[PDB]
Amino acid sequence: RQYELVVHTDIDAAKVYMGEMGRLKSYENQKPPFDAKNPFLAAVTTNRKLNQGTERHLMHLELDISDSKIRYESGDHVAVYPANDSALVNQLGKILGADLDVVMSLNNLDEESNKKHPFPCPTSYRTALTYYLDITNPPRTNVLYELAQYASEPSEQELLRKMASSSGEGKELYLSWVVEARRHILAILQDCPSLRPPIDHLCELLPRLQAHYYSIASSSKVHPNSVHICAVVVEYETKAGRINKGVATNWLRAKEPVNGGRALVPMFVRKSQFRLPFKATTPVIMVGPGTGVAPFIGFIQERAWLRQQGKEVGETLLYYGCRRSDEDYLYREELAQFHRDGALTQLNVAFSREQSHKVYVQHLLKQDREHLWKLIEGGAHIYVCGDARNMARDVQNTFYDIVAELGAMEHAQAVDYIKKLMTKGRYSLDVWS
Numbered sequence: 001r002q003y004e005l006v007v008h009t010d011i012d013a014a015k016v017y018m019g020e021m022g023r024l025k026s027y028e029n030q031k032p033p034f035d036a037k038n039p040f041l042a043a044v045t046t047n048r049k050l051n052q053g054t055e056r057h058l059m060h061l062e063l064d065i066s067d068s069k070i071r072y073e074s075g076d077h078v079a080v081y082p083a084n085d086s087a088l089v090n091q092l093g094k095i096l097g098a099d100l101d102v103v104m105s106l107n108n109l110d111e112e113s114n115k116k117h118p119f120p121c122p123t124s125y126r127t128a129l130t131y132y133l134d135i136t137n138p139p140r141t142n143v144l145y146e147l148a149q150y151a152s153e154p155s156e157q158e159l160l161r162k163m164a165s166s167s168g169e170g171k172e173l174y175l176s177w178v179v180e181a182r183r184h185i186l187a188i189l190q191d192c193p194s195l196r197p198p199i200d201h202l203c204e205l206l207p208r209l210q211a212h213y214y215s216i217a218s219s220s221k222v223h224p225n226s227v228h229i230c231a232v233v234v235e236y237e238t239k240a241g242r243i244n245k246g247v248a249t250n251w252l253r254a255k256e257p258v259n260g261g262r263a264l265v266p267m268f269v270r271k272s273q274f275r276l277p278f279k280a281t282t283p284v285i286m287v288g289p290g291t292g293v294a295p296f297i298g299f300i301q302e303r304a305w306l307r308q309q310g311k312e313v314g315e316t317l318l319y320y321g322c323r324r325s326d327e328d329y330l331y332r333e334e335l336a337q338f339h340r341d342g343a344l345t346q347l348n349v350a351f352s353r354e355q356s357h358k359v360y361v362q363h364l365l366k367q368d369r370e371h372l373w374k375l376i377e378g379g380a381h382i383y384v385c386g387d388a389r390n391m392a393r394d395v396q397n398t399f400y401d402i403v404a405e406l407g408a409m410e411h412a413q414a415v416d417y418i419k420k421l422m423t424k425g426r427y428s429l430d431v432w433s
């Protein structure tokens with residue numbers, strides 16, 4: 001293996017990592033500048049449910065960044081360093097027969113290597129499993145390969161070796177049993193009960209818990225000291241009878257502003273190129289169904305603020321979409337108000353499940369082809385946010401058709417027309433999977 005275990009049975013508390021990603025005690029003793037290595041622990045001042053129905057949980061959070069000196073603009077992303085579910089960590093410690101509160105360090109056997117440890121050390125197994133390791137995604141084949149030796153029941157050891165191998169059947173079993181069944185490490189330990197790996201080796205094998213990104217849903221012109229997040233919680237039943245929970249979204253959902261004690265979220269801002277036009281008079285066309293509406297809430301807040309200040313602001317159009325108006329229409333109240341006040345020139349919403357067939361944002365775009373062409377020819381900026389798997393492409397193709405038709409040009413010329421808009425920064429995307 002790559003690291004050797006050094007147990008610290010008599011270490012001073014002040015020398016022990018408790019979840020910080022960078023410098024020891026940086027989470028507790030907060031000093032700017034705040035960035036990825038020194039994230040700001042923002043207090044959650046608001047955490048509320050956005051959707052009307054109960055099929056899913058969509059939430060709006062407001063993170064207090066006052067005194068952080070952090071600067072941001074609508075369009076930027078906010079990264080958060082989440083924590084795993086404490087109950088899940090507890091289950092892992094129990095099934096492994098390990099004392100999670102043991103403080104230790106895993107040191108690279110190669111004393112010259114720049115990578116001295118697998119994560120911040122010294123630290124306890126509980127802390128590592130909570131803040132530093134990924135214990136929810138399907139383990140890679142290499143992890144299964146190393147774990148097989150620890151399964152004392154021959155049949156289970158054979159199963160693990162098979163799924164970690166390159167045999168035809170082995171690959172199909174891994175695909176269905178680990179990947180498709182979404183079996184995380186605890187699920188594997190439960191389904192192969194003879195598997196008893198030492199916790200320190202397990203901590204060396206698992207991947208690191210990663211920062212998760214969200215599109216800031218506020219304008220710094222309106223909320224300079226608060227960063228807002230709009231997110232859908234990930235929670236589903238697996239094909240193995242278990243309930244899997246997305247790490248960051250369930251961690252955020254549990255952040256109660258609230259005995260007192262503020263709910264803190266370690267975060268940092270990652271600058272993007274997704275930006276409103278330099279001139280407020282320039283029109284904007286925003287397309288963002290579902291949580292893709294996130295950055296546009298900030299855009300609209302900003303355009304509304306500018307109008308309120310007394311500045312001239314161009315047309316501001318939003319093409320939003322949800323399943324049902326009484327199920328998951330995000331920011332329905334806020335958007336209605338912005339429209340009523342004139343901040344939002346047009347509020348076009350596609351309710352995809354209110355009829356037998358699908359009605360999506362691109363259907364509304366095409367039906368508004370005339371005005372959209374007028375706006376585009378006039379210098380308007382187009383923005384698309386949300387699903388990158390199909391929505392983004394479908395929307396792009398719709399703009400191709402609009403330009404080809406009303407622009408009286410061939411598809412090829414339409415593609416070049418849109419591509420030039422992208423190079424000129426007039427067609428921007430903020431999509432994810």
Ligand SMILES: Cc1cc2nc3c(=O)[nH]c(=O)nc-3n(C[C@H](O)[C@H](O)[C@H](O)COP(=O)(O)OP(=O)(O)OC[C@H]3O[C@@H](n4cnc5c(N)ncnc54)[C@H](O)[C@@H]3O)c2cc1C
Binds near residue numbers: 212250433
């Ligand atoms: C630049 C950028 C901006 C983003 N902005 C936003 C935003 O504004 N709002 C927002 O809500 N999200 C946003 N996301 C998505 C966000 O970063 C997270 O991926 C999402 O919140 C899920 O994280 P999690 O920690 O809860 O899930 P994780 O624990 O990371 O788990 C996610 C994984 O679970 C699996 N999964 C999810 N649902 C199912 C299912 N039904 N069945 C089987 N497997 C499933 C997939 O393999 C998925 O990759 C953005 C992503 C990027 C890259």
